[PDB]
């Protein structure tokens, strides 16, 4: 196959629940292993943006988004926020791709100062310290220059700065094609089959 | 009147034509007077991501705008690439806030280093020297380092750096909500009355 | 009316003593009230470029200002160097506006390290901490980089710099063409009305 | 096969034009797909140093290409300087590597500033953004230090700084030994075989 | 002779087209030789702001200039934006001295990134890597923090910043006594002899 | 003649009287134009350090040395700490070259921020501003990091930081041959001749 | 005479051992005088990359390249890399211009730290600190941000960075056209006159 | 007793091999334990500067070393370039105060930038770890950016940086009194009795 056989996404409490779940959606179809984490606003989000009933417990909501993604036994797994005992608390874990969608200005700024107060902010620092892929999808507007100095900082250390920015040149018609075109840029940005968005002037053989 | 009386509007090519059509249609309404510019570029974008024909010649282009938008006589004024006898080419210019968007990254680079190549990037430049509004949409993924830096150079001299980056917590249900709340995010930042947006939390008194 | 009720007005000795009994002149007939500050230095530039015979001593220059201008009793206030009881000296004294024209490259200097070792330097010091208007009108040439520093590190802090630096896009017949074109343009920066200089293009409809 | 499939090769003015025709021909031999961008300065400097008759019209500037390298039918595609519709303008692009050969000063700080004013320009930013390789071979002497930090920005950046600054160490005989030594050098930098360049010291096994 | 025999004459879109006519006037009376480049926004600035009809093209503008100067045949040579084959164009011609006055705050930015977008910003590209005198005569007010920044980087690199911002410490009299004394400093820059301006202090011996 | 005609040679109050004398004995015997100032606290160093009984003002003060020095009536021009009309403080100027010895941390301080505070001051700030050669010989030990940043400012911009450490590979037999290096140093950075200094190795033709 | 009477040319470990043995000669043929130094891993790069059998002691050496090149007696002097007796190992020697060429990588970081470890390096330091011209031919590709950091600082430093980068717009047709291109910059660089490249333009007189 | 028992004194190949024999001296006669390190290039300057032979050895060094300071059995230690068994080149050593003087200008960049090549650079390395006592006494003159950049970086990070810049405010009679005083500021430094030195105004008690 085609990009990692494991990523994995931290939502946290931006805006854009909708990213998250359809990522996961589509990291399922490509039969991913997928480590799944959650920080207790990005909950609250989910519940604000969505109809999705997310259980709040690692175990249930495991069983859960199994269900809801028709994955496969064991192909998400979930882990608490405190628990260090998961493979992406440590260096020495299998490596994996690591994507926070959406990331909070919070979580942004966490990883960039390397705060590691929980497990996806250990995560990430893991993944900055392995150089890893490592993607943030921040949600926000204006951009402060406290996250432009956190982002450029990410950005020089090797980490893709992807905002849910999703671009208009493909016609988008609902809100589903819009969270699938950022959805798309992070499939391309780790090298995972998809077919939501087009490979722009691929047919183009000269100028007209 | 609340916010700006005149708003030099810059559309340059980036994707998102919908957000600086839409922003020119609530200005309209709210009966502010717009100084309004556009790129080679931005032009071929609206061709590809919209149905409006418009008009490449300033004055055809500023009477198909005035129909378009339902506008009064000279509320909205166009001018050329190079027409440096436009007011926004100098700080002795009546008081005009700027909004650039959508925002390329061409253009974002061009206004960070000075450039001042045509009379949007001029427009710019001015508008920083004389410490006059300037918000700019960027709508770009990922963002590199060069394209961060150039934001929080801005941003650190007062420029508003608003990406097109729309949030869901008011559960979006079509692509036009999606443009009316990055639309709704501009008219806030400039002090111009709007009501696509609530005001968030305003009814809520204690924590629950 | 529009704009600051007061203006904290120093001259210190770099040359363009006109541009500041020009702009003194434009700020009483605008029946604003006038802190008036001169360094040691900007006397002697004054005598030795006008046939203005400025009296040494506060009070006396006091009495000579006011008539000199037409200013109405009380409405020009000159503080000596040392005077700490002026209001200039304190960030609890009632906001003023405030204008270094001409402005040195020594007392650019000192208002940039904060040195604070005269009235006129502790005056702009305070202005920067309450973050309230301070322009600063050099004149030099070259600029050394010793200078740029200074000017960068204080415009980055919000003051505007604004060289003495008339422009010629009015056809200007007279030296007093050129120092009214300054001065406007630091009255424009005030948001003080005035008629000397035309609001560019504000005539000029679309693009010919 | 080794290295990628797809190189996008664009000329810039920079003196040199032997170094990108004969890198072009190495790419056509080794069976890649080329996507082909000239600026107007590289097409002088072209016709200046070399007895290429290169058409001026895209679609005639790939018929001639094709002819005088060899290539297959749509092997070597040509894009004019304003196609955005061509892959190289967006990162949802399928991946290319990227060389610049020869690179101008001027298109070295377009590139470093992001200044995206062209399809070269804009196809380096994109290449920047999406991480996908890119070379840059500058010809200039001296190197003054705004050279120095547009090259030291990109290098930061992840872009390869291969000045066109040939070896001697085996005892080149003719100047196509010099060019073919830069040219190794670049497809030993993106991983495509040449047999022009020795492996050094590959049949060293112990120190004498 | 003093100074140099050979000067590379910039004229860009500031205001203040009086300062370079009358510069490229001394610099024929003191017999050098004068390269001749003017930007088309400067051409603009010169029909605004004289009563000078000058040619567009070089060779009706290089006829049209000598005649108007007095200049011998040959001594203003006069050279298109993108006349590479121009000395100025490469570190191997003869020596010059280049002056931009006025300079923009557009070519201000091109010299300080690089962008060597036309045969003045490459020639000031030139100058500076190959350590020859470069003058820039800025006319601009306020300076924001993007001008002070670029001319911080190139005063850094050896280029003098020379704004446009003339002396009153001789009294003068008429517009052209201001126009020049900015040109007698450049003349003092370049080492070039000069009788617009004394030698400050010259006949005085000790202090009084 | 080699060298500068005319030496700005200013006093301050750092230990080592005997160097600026010195320098100044041998600025006379080259037949050279002094322009002499020396700091109040200078003054007192003199006093303190030597036997040279120098009067307290300017005029007295020239009369003496140049009675001192055995120099030609106006050869030694002295001027006062607040004569701005005296040639140092303008760039207008005649050029000079400019030293100071001994130059205190606190007349370092004010060259390196531009402080002005008086004709020494200014001088430098106008020889950096110009181009003009200024050499500080700082006597003071340790060095703290704001002694070093300041010297470390002003050597980047052009100024020779001279600190007054003789050397010993010469055998010096006597304080009056330590003070003779120190004051070659400064002759040959001037490019006046000397003979206090053999050129090290001059005769020395192949290694040993 | 035109140009530097005294020329410090050091050879070090680049590869391009022709472009120093050339400069030698030319330096030679045009009268100046020559303080040859070499280091212990050019005498490989030559043994490498030429016939010449260069004696390994400096007299034997000296005596060697003074019959290569036809020099004069005395007119070659050579230097070993410890003796500290040699003028290029003090400031108080006759003033040198100094050329490294070619530039290893490490002599480029020795220079740039100050390490002084040999003649070569020390000599740089003190053409440094002297500000005496030193120029720097380094052979490399790619430049890492090591190389390029170096590079950075010594051209800001006033060091002319001139890479063995030679320019192919007079059509070279051999290795020494190459050769002669970089060696001919290098003179230019110094103000010694050479006939092997053309001043750019010259007959050039106004444009086509 | 006060001040460091032990003291490291390295000596390297600066000027001024009498400021290190003294301070030898004045250490031996406080009755403290010196582990004594000399350069190769500093054996050159001793042999130079004075009429002391000192044998080349390690051993036979400190035999001579011993009877020419009158020191006891074991008070001068001396450790060879290479002895990484000698307890300046570990931490785990007991604690020492270092001086290295005379410091050349190689010894400086070596200690600023870690290069740890010799026993000197290493324990000087060791004492910045340990934040244990490491004084510096460079000889140079002019300093370049260079120096000044190293002895900045080692004065931020706790080195003092104590330049052979000897004061004249006691009048000093000979060589020995200037050499004295800069032995007595490292003494006092150190915190190290010395009466070479008086405490300036001890007896001074209220203002004359
Ligand atoms: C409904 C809703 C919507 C948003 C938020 C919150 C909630 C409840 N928050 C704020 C964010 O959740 C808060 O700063 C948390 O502290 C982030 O913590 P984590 O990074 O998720 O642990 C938030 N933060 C952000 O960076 N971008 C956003 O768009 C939003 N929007
Ligand atoms: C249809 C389409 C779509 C896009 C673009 C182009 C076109 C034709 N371009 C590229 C951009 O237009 C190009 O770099 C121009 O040089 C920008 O020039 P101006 O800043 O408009 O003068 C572009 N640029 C950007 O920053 N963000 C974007 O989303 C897009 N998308
Ligand atoms: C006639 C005349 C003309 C000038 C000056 C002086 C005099 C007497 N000075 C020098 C300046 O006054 C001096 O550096 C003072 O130290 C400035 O002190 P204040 O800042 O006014 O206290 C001066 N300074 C400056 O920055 N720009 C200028 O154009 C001039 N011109
Ligand atoms: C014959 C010839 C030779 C050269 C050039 C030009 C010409 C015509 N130019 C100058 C360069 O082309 C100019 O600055 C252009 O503006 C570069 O534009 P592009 O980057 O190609 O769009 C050039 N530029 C450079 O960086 N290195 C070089 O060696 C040369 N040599
Ligand atoms: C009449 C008039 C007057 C001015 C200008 C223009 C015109 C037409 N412009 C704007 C400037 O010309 C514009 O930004 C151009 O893009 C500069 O391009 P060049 O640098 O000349 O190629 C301008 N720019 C500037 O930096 N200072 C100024 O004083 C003025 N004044
Ligand atoms: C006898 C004597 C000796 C010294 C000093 C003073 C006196 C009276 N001062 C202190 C210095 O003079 C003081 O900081 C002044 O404020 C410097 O002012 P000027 O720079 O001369 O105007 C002093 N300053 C310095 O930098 N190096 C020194 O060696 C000395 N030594
Ligand atoms: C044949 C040959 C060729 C090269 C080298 C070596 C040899 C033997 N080296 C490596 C370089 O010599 C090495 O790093 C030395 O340590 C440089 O030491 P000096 O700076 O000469 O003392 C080298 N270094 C460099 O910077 N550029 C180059 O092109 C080469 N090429
Ligand atoms: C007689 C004599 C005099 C001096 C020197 C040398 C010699 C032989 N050197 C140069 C210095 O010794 C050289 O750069 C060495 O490489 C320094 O190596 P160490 O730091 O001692 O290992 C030297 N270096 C320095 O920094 N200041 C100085 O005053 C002198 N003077
Ligand atoms: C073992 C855990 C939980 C963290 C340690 O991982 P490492 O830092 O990569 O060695
Ligand atoms: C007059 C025009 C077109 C530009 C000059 O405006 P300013 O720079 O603000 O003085
Ligand atoms: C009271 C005086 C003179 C200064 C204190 O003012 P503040 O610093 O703004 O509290
Ligand atoms: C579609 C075009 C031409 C540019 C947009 O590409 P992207 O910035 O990578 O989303
Ligand atoms: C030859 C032209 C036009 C530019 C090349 O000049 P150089 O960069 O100085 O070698
Ligand atoms: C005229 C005096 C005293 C200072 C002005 O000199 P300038 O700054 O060089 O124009
Ligand atoms: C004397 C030698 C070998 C070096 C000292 O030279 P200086 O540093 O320039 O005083
Ligand atoms: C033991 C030796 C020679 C060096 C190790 O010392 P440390 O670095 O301080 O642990
Ligand atoms: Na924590
Ligand atoms: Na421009
Ligand atoms: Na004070
Ligand atoms: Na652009
Ligand atoms: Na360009
Ligand atoms: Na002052
Ligand atoms: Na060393
Ligand atoms: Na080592």
Redesign the interface.
Known sequence: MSGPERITLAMTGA????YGLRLLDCLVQEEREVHFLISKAAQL?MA??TDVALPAKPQAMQAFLTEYCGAAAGQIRVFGQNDWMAPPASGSSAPNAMVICPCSTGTLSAVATGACNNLIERAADVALKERRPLVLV????????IH??N??KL??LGA??????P???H?????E??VDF?V??IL??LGIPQDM??????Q?????
């Open positions: 805006s854009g629940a909708q989000v604000t943006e921040p949600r926000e507007a204006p951009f402060s220059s432009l100095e982002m450029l950005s020089n893709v700065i992807l905002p849910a920015a671009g208009f040149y016609q988008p018609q609902s809100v094609d819009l950022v798309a840029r391309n940005t968005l087009p490979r722009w002037g691929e183009h053989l000269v100028s007209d």
